[PDB]
Paper text:
Using a phylogenomics-based approach and complementary structural techniques, we identify a family of dimeric hemoproteins comprising a domain of unknown function DUF2470. The heme iron is axially coordinated by two zinc-bound histidine residues, forming a distinct two-fold symmetric zinc-histidine-iron-histidine-zinc site. Together with structure-guided in vitro and in vivo experiments, we further demonstrate the existence of a functional link between heme binding by Dri1 ([name] 1, formerly [name]) and post-translational regulation of succinate dehydrogenase in the cyanobacterium Synechocystis, suggesting an iron-dependent regulatory link between photosynthesis and respiration. Given the ubiquity of proteins containing homologous domains and connections to heme metabolism across eukaryotes and prokaryotes, we propose that [name] ([name]; formerly DUF2470) functions at the molecular level as a heme-dependent regulatory domain.
Looking at the sequence conservation of these residues, we observe strict conservation of His16 and His21 (numeration based on the Synechocystis protein sequence) throughout different phyla, with the exception of GBP. Radius of gyration (Rg) values from Guinier analyses and molecular weight estimations confirm that Dri1 without heme remains monomeric and heme-bound Dri1 is dimeric. Dimensionless Kratky plots further indicate that binding to heme decreases protein flexibility. We used homology modeling and docking analyses to predict candidate residues for a heme-free Dri1-SdhB1 heterodimer. SdhB1 residues, namely Cys214, Tyr215, and Glu219, were computationally predicted to interact with Dri1 zinc-binding residues (His16, His21, His79, and Glu76). Therefore, under low cellular heme availability, Dri1 binds to SdhB, preventing SdhB docking to the membrane-bound domain HdrB.
Author numbering:
A (entry chain BBB), B (entry chain DDD), C (entry chain AAA), D (entry chain CCC): 3 to 103
Write the structure that this text describes.
């Protein structure tokens, strides 16, 4: 059930390998990062995730706190996939809301 | 001043008697050990240290490898103290790097 | 002793967090990639290491085979640190031995 | 058909009879198990499959979570075969671009 640091290590590796676009998208939307070229997960725990975010001339580490705490490892992948969808939707709505002085 | 079995014993005794919180921190942070009941140094050598950890009634030996070989015995205490500061400081974000879903 | 998949993951995670510039360097010199923005270790085993390299173009996986197989897991770090030195020291002699046609 | 425990029983049974080398391959690659004697599927459900893995020493149960939940309208025999291919394929990407120190 609970999220051992070894399962965090495995979740992060899986997401870095097979969902690098979802992580850039987390960093862009929840991370409010701009000209994000790439992003990797470094840790996940029940309250949030550590992302390393590369811009066109440097890198930083950000934290994204979850609205809901992560109960069980067995859910983490379905929740991260749902956050990637939610992030798609919120990025779409924001990009639409451009006004000019 | 090469590190010997004798010196190792004494370093371990000192850290166990006087720096018990530091060893738990090592096990928790570097060793990724969760719900840890006891942690003690068993041995130290130039390249690393061996820890015995009780998590759930059961015990294992974990090894933490140093980023750098210890030059000599006289460096051990100052490296272990610094390593306890280093461990207290993993996770920590600039603040400007904290966001929310 | 034996380099396990679990230890591979730990070495790669360490190298990606503490030595990212070293891995970019491996991709550059050992991996003859010239355009390299960044690079992550994906796996390490006794005979070599697997890298994801990002060029402006995009991403690719490469493998670098060690000259001598890793004797064990505890040798990995000192071998990687030495390879980073090997790698930084390729543009050497030529520096003082410039001649003109 | 949707995955009832009676359906799991027949899928596992066939895999365990006709595809034991695939089940061992799941456990070695996906499951990161080494020195595996053999391995059996004990159960499969929309989100993953439970394997029993035996090593020289003893046995252990692992779970492998599917990228996509199974939709029943998609077969599983064919899906597990795809997973068998994808497992042999892991590493092959990187080992195609082999370099030497
Ligand atoms: Zn002291
Ligand atoms: Zn290091
Ligand atoms: Zn079949
Ligand atoms: Zn996935």
């Amino acid at each position: 059930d609970p999220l051992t640091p070894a399962i965090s290590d495995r979740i992060c590796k899986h997401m870095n390998e097979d969902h690098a676009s979802a992580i850039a998208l987390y960093a862009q939307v929840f991370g409010q990062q701009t000209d994000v070229t790439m992003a990797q997960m470094q840790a996940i725990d029940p309250t949030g995730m550590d992302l390393v975010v590369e811009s066109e001339g440097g890198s930083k580490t950000i934290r994204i706190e979850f609205e809901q705490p992560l109960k069980d490892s067995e859910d983490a992948h379905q929740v991260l996939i749902a956050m990637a969808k939610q992030a798609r939707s919120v990025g779409k709505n924001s990009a639409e809301n451009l006004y000019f002085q």
